[PDB]
């Protein structure tokens, strides 16, 4: 049985960065050759595994996370980068064996009005711990006032939309990201090639 690589790389919607949709591929022959078929991956950028060898290796599970970040930020979803996206929204660990893959999903996620359903977290008190997932609506203040959750001086809604719109340049265009990781534990490996 082959691993279900088709509902991960094709879906009609992808998780927005604040909710980053992790998933688990387990107990299946996985040939990472099913892909390399449709993604002119801007940045396949695999780290440490390289393409041919993983056809060969076997591991306990493969974790595939999916997000939608605009083009200028695709650099940040990598190891060792700092910025709004990798510090308040998704943090890759310092050490990694995985392949970020991004394709310009201009056609599906672009609304001429804007697609206000894709959003990112502008402000958080501390940088996210590696692979942390954080989902909340809580007001961020600058003053000491609790502010009672209203839109006012020193009171703001932390998520903000990407405002994706077609007449926008390459920098501001949806770029779906799939961060495949390789988890190996002392338990017997079940995801071979």
């Amino acid at each position: 049985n082959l691993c279900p690589f088709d509902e991960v790389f094709n879906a009609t919607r992808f998780a927005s960065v604040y909710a980053w949709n992790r998933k688990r591929i387990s107990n299946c022959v996985a040939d990472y050759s099913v892909l390399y078929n449709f993604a002119p991956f801007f940045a396949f950028k695999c780290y440490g595994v390289s393409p041919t060898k993983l056809n060969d290796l076997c591991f306990t599970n493969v974790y595939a996370d999916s997000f939608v970040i605009r083009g200028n930020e695709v650099s940040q979803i990598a190891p060792g980068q700092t910025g709004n996206i990798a510090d308040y929204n998704y943090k890759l660990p310092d050490d990694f064996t995985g392949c970020v893959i991004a394709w310009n999903s201009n056609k599906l996620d672009s609304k001429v009005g804007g697609n206000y359903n894709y959003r990112y977290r502008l402000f958080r008190k501390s940088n996210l711990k590696p692979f942390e997932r954080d989902i909340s609506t809580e007001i961020y203040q600058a003053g000491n006032k609790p502010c009672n959750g209203v839109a006012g001086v020193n009171c703001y809604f932390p998520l903000q939309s990407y405002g994706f719109r077609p007449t926008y340049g390459v920098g501001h265009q949806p770029y779906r990201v799939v961060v495949l990781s390789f988890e190996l534990l002392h338990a017997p490996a079940t995801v071979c090639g």
Partner: antibody
Amino acid sequence: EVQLVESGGDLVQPGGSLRLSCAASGFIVSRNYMSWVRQAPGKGLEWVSSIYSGGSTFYAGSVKGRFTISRDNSKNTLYLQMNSLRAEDTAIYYCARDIPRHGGDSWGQGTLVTVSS
Amino acid sequence: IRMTQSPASLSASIGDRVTITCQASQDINKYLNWYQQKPGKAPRLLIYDASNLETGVPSRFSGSGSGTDFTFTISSLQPEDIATYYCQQYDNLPITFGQGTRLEIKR
């Protein structure tokens, strides 16, 4: 009132180390985006350094490794430790809080640095 | 970004309609702020995002733009409007300001 007395610095020999201090009225320094612009006399303002709400530091090309930024929770006082100075750093330095997208600002009156021999 | 402001000596009489044009080298979308620096006194923020004038400003200054070329407008030139205006882009890490357009009054 967001009024800033970012007043530190007056001048040193070339190769010295000065220490700026900023200050803060309605907000806390460690919770809001802040940065330090640099206005040379008679020239367009240039951007030196910037801090984030979680400690991320970004610098300018001309100040890579000579300048440092540092944020002080105890007394506001966004600190900028100028090190490895030179004879072309003479400029007026303004403390600045930038809320990123929703729009408000503080640019404090700013302090003069004339570092010479 | 190679920010470019085209008018540097522009002089209009009392109560006139003038316009400032800041131009960029890439798509900065709408993230370009307009500043106003009076002589000696610290700069003020006039139009954040290129399309939103901050509250409390008088209501004459309007700006609109997208992608590379941006424009700044002055609706009523009151005598107490002499300053130097700057355009800043705040989302590309090498934040580069513009040259300034020193405005003066004629009589």
